[PDB]
Amino acid sequence: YRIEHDTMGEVRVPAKALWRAQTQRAVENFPISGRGLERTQIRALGLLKGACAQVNSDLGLLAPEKADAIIAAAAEIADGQHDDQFPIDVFQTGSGTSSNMNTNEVIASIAAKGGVTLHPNDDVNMSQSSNDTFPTATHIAATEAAVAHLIPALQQLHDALAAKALDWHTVVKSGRTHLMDAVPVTLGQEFSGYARQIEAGIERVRACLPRLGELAIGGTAVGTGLNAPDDFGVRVVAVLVAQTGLSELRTAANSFEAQAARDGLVEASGALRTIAVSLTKIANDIRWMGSGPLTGLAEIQLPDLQKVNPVLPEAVTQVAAQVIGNDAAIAWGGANGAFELNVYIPMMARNILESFKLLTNVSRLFAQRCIAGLTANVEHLRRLAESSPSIVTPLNSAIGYEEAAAVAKQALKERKTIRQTVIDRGLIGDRLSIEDLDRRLDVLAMAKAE
Amino acid sequence: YRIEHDTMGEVRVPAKALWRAQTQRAVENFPISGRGLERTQIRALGLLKGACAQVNSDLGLLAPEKADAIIAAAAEIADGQHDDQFPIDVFQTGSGTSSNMNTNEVIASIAAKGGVTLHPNDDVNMSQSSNDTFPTATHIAATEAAVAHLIPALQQLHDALAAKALDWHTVVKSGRTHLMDAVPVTLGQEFSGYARQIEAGIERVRACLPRLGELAIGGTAVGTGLNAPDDFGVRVVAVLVAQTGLSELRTAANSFEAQAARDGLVEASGALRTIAVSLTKIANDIRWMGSGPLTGLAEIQLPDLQKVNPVLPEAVTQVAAQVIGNDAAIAWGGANGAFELNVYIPMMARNILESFKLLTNVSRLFAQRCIAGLTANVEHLRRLAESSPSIVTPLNSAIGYEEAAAVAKQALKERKTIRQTVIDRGLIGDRLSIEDLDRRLDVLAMAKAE
Amino acid sequence: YRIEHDTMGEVRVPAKALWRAQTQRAVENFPISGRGLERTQIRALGLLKGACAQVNSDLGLLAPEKADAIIAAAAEIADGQHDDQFPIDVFQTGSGTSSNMNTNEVIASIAAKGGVTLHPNDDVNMSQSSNDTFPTATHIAATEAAVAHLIPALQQLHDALAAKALDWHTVVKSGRTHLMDAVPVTLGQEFSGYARQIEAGIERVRACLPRLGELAIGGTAVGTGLNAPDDFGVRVVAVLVAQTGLSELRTAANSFEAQAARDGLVEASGALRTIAVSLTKIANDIRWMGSGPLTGLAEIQLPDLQPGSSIMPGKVNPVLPEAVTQVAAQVIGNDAAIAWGGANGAFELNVYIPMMARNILESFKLLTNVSRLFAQRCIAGLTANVEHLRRLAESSPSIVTPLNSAIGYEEAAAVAKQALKERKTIRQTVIDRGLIGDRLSIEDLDRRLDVLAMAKAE
Amino acid sequence: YRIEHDTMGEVRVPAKALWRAQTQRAVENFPISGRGLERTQIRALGLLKGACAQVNSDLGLLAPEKADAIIAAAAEIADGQHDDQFPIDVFQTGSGTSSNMNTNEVIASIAAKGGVTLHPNDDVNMSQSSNDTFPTATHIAATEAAVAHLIPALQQLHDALAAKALDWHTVVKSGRTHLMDAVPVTLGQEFSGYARQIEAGIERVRACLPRLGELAIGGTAVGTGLNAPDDFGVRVVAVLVAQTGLSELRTAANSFEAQAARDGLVEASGALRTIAVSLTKIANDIRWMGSGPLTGLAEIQLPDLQKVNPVLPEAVTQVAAQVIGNDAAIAWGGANGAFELNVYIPMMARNILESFKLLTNVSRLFAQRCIAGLTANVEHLRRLAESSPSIVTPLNSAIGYEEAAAVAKQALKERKTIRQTVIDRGLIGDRLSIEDLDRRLDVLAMAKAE
């Protein structure tokens, strides 16, 4: 209910609110989505403000009393004690200056409860600009999401898929190409392909980390580092690596590229989009294999969570669609920078951090509550394998290339199986027993598993 | 922390939660995004459950005391009193069955507090299925968002752009093509173009409403209407039209197309994506025309809300990026239906309803706090038009294209008007009077303004 | 290899080439894709230059013998006689001025072969600019593609789908929701849904034509109409509508909007993208229903079009559904390229026109041609596996619901369990549990378990 | 016309055509786009057919005289002598079966001219399927395009941008953030940022090559390798590496993943889409820097190729839009595989090969005919930097905020340098010396450049 005073008039701020006038003005300016920064973004901004205060204190630019108060207040924010103190819309000034100032004001208020006076700009924002802070917090959050959350979740899914690839190594079935009956495969072979797709997904995330982990901090307003110490960036990054354990964080290769563009987020989103494409194929194959039971393929049974509807495959395919959409928004913002600043950072941050979160959470649920509990309908799968087309090649050593070719042509002409065409042509004899025919054409042998 | 008993056993539900066991199971099954239904889809689910109870009562299928209890509870949900009673993630079973059951459970808990016992399935879900209700609610929410909120917001922006077009009718300036100087226009003419883009946007939204307003209700599980009265659909739609005033709501032309596909949302997103494209052009031009104050175009001054940064053009271009991403997600879900049900409905609903909300809110903000307060640097704009090499063409018939090109070169080098350069070069004679010069170089006449 | 002189040097030009120095400069400047304008864009540039000459002649601005030479030359271009004379890359100056000048030069060279000297700029480009012509030709081409080609092809597919809906009106089968067994439908009902998606697609194309048909012609360099007659736009549109029969063409509502933006192409692409979404669902369902035959759903048989495999000689694949789904993917890609160019205009001109024109006209062409092939080579010849589909419907646990009021929902569920376990029809299972008696005759069982009546067919 | 035959019977084929029955059926089945395989794709199919015949001959499965005839025919195809004999549409069967048979039939017809009888399926397609040959030919073409064409084109553009970064190292100018005047930078620093974007693009392409270079060859119909030698793939890949010098070509890690999905093309397209995003930023900035010559920024002059219109920036930004569109088509195909085969290969191949070609060709043109020739308006750039309100801040501690604001306002109004305004306002002596003024306002020192 309390009032504050701003160099354009009077500002009313809620009573239990640690934010001040600049934040309140941003609240009134951007009532667009009704959604603010996520826990991960707030955490990153607190981590960054603590590291900046630490470096400003080490360089003798900030009195140690003020630094200690900023560091303690920032630690509270990084630990999630103030997630309710960040009310600014995602759809704000495109630098993220509004959220940067929100962090400065909340730290100033937390410090005042402890008896220390901080200026949000001159103290909490010392050596920083309105323009190198929010992109840095974005890349911290995205790198933490990749390394600490997504990669382990994808590994859990990979390991679940790989476990089925081994458990079903000899569970023969019919191949399907173009949705049509094809030569035999095993259910384990198919799952070995799903596992490879997730393993390649982890490789793709790893491959983007050298650029995703680049931080703009130290570049200040335009990338030149004016009004910051020359080594501010390298010193702040070392504090962040030590606090977070994220060795993937690093100073930008080029301080102009790191502020004029967000290409690292565009690159990372392409890795997440590829994983969404992989997850769509895996999830679609799994719900088709589970389909029916009478009208479908009925190859496997999915665990029942809610005739079991494939509710986790539907959650996975819906997440994949969202990641594809978010990826388009990210590329659109990425392309539209101008001169020294890309001003799409809040929108790009929301979208990539959501894509990380959705893929992390759905991959773990898919792994644990769908893949791990799948059961194969082994006898049904063998009946499908025993209904696949056969080939004459494995008879060559027995009947010769010429008789084999005549078997092939007559089977095609009369729409008969290879097996029955061999019987009908009277080839069961010294060259070939019925047991020899059955060994040579065995559907597990045709799958070339063992 | 109260206890409830399901098929599969025990489940704890918060004390003050009005949802029951099936919602709490869905909370446990889908911890993916941490974002549930928006206030417009919760409202629509309420409007729909009220209308269904009305019709079941009208047809003598549901006891009137039970129908009255449903209608009273549904009106509270429609009025936004229970937005906190819908905790299920967007990324749920693709039919939206979980959120349909959430609505049925919340209505039964509200009715219970007024002394009336309702069965969530047998009473609140009477005549309905898990597959025709959620997409009906989605199309009610989207139609209401288009008619009641977006069209009026767009008309407000149209009227602000049109008002500036009139105020700046004679504000002559340099045209620009390929970013290069061109013959004269007025700011009014440019703003008349912006206004047409927004008027055409309203035409595009109106043009999608015949199909956006199609409702699946009555089609039950697969579109056949098995286990509903034959006229359930037309009765429920008529009650929704009577109660909401939305005459755009209609029973679907084909009950199978209305459940197998969500093509109406794909179509409406296309209109929203086109408006986003328009708004990007308008917002980009306005921030470029405000660029400066020294090294940019310096054509206009934007009202200062937060070096006056174009923060509302940034909000508008970020919203447009989000609408473009959401549009890609919607089309992806739309294409991937199978047989009798498209199972991407929760993801498509989130995206379409967000696109409507963002465009509505940012259009009003852009109109009121950017467009209405723009001010033109009238003298600068006319002096540059009068100094541009582009305007020497109408001198050619008096002094020839070679002397006209010398005038253009000296005017630019000396930063003089074309008029002053022609006088300084001693061209005023019988060949060319001062009055013929002023006629030939009348830049506002060159713009050909009404 | 004849040589020419531009206001900036000498340029070598092929001997049989009707283009001249500005076009040859554009050829050397933009070796990017190796693809130029399509027949439909060249036709529209010819129509436009012919109409402009007719109007300039009627207004006393262009000498009659010069106008007549332009009209004759422009008719040859519109008739597809010169599709080899437009070598400039699609990825050219973003106004399309290079292609505008290509048209003006080729007309000048055609007129020269009949003894008339035309100045490419002063005669063939009279009353026009480098900025209002190419987007006009783009919108002519797109409107013609929508009205004369896409809508008729979509109508042919609609009619083929609707004919199957009528033929299969009693072909009962189990519904599928979430890919799981559901209550009965008919294959005619499902095909009625596909028909409605195509009919809605035609409605979406129609709804965009009031803005797709808006032409910029007459707005000249910046939209103001400086250096054109005040009524040049309405006069040229009148001639184009009269000669083409394209009733949807009109002068832009706002001459600035018509050059600063290409929002009509973005709008129209959304309709094509929605059609691509519909065709994806239709084509996917059809290839699933054709799947197997032994390991798939085997609901229908697609006409055989070509051998599928040398390793599996009998195998035939759903090649038309695959062409349709691949076209749909291309339309979705093209749609993203069009929106991208549409958003990025500046001030008086959008400079993405050649790229947006390539993408929109290609989407029109691919959907037109694949729709006709899908209708003729796939839908028309489909056959239903009627006995298969009825057997599954009659054995479905989903159909026990109508027994509730005779034997109660618990005995109905037990019938479902036993049927599904013993691979029996519901009818037979009801019998094998001795439930025929006082509550339920054998005729009353046959009424309740009538799967076609449960589909509720009209 | 002549008569040819396949397993479905008799087909009329143009008398002179080198293709046979299956190609002609495909000509009639797929008249959709009117465009067929590109040179690069026909080249790869020829390389692969030759390598397969070499390995079949080395394993004693194919007669040396037949292998020689195939290798010679395949060489003519790879060289481009028969591009007119590949009439099949891009939009064909989704495995590329039709273009595989086109290659087999054309090789058979060429071999027949030389008096050798080859069966298109039994000899030219020995040990092969379409399912492994067409994606192998697609990944050979894409890997070649990446390594031999795109990376060298991007290196040329990087080197032109880096040459400018050096040439313009001391060309001081106004920074611009939010399109608004900011503290100084140099054109050199801006160009260093563009150079980094292109170097990072090269790093993105190199990071995708471990998976783009994976070939399916040897997996035959379903991934199992049925009807091929167990080492067919390792042997064919060694021949292709020897013949192409592309060490990036490798056996697939998993034979099922390599046929059930095309994730490597989706991944590579992501890299191309990021480069398009970068090139959009670079081209936009360059055309805005060239804007004018009177009413725009007038920072640089572009070389004149056709009011010098920025035609190469326009070509670059149109190419970028096409790469973004193609990228969406590729991802859509990538996701929609089923079981053992993704059947979007011809469409995904068209799009990713086009994206490689357009970026290759436009990057070389941009580097040579735009970047190399730019000239800077050095005096204008410095005068505006020296005249900008943004550089008054370092005076704050000598003259006070109020007087720094008055200096900035007078400098803008009079169009004077900040240095001359401070002198004109009488502030030298009291507040600071000339030596102090020249140190505080040195715009090249403020850019942190020397």
Ligand SMILES: CNS(=O)(=O)c1ccc(OC)c(NC(=O)Cc2n[nH]c(=O)c3ccccc23)c1
């Ligand atoms: C003179 N200071 S001012 O008024 O405050 C001012 C501010 C901003 C400006 O462009 C953003 C300009 N433009 C110009 O000086 C335009 C111009 N005219 N004539 C030339 O020969 C020339 C040469 C190179 C570059 C530009 C030009 C002038």
Ligand SMILES: CNS(=O)(=O)c1ccc(OC)c(NC(=O)Cc2n[nH]c(=O)c3ccccc23)c1
């Ligand atoms: C002076 N003719 S010129 O050199 O040929 C020229 C050309 C182009 C320009 O901007 C594209 C400019 N800019 C300005 O005049 C900048 C400017 N300075 N001071 C003012 O008080 C002012 C007020 C309103 C708008 C701009 C200003 C100047």
Ligand SMILES: [Mg+2]
């Ligand atoms: Mg580490």
Ligand SMILES: [Mg+2]
């Ligand atoms: Mg079956």
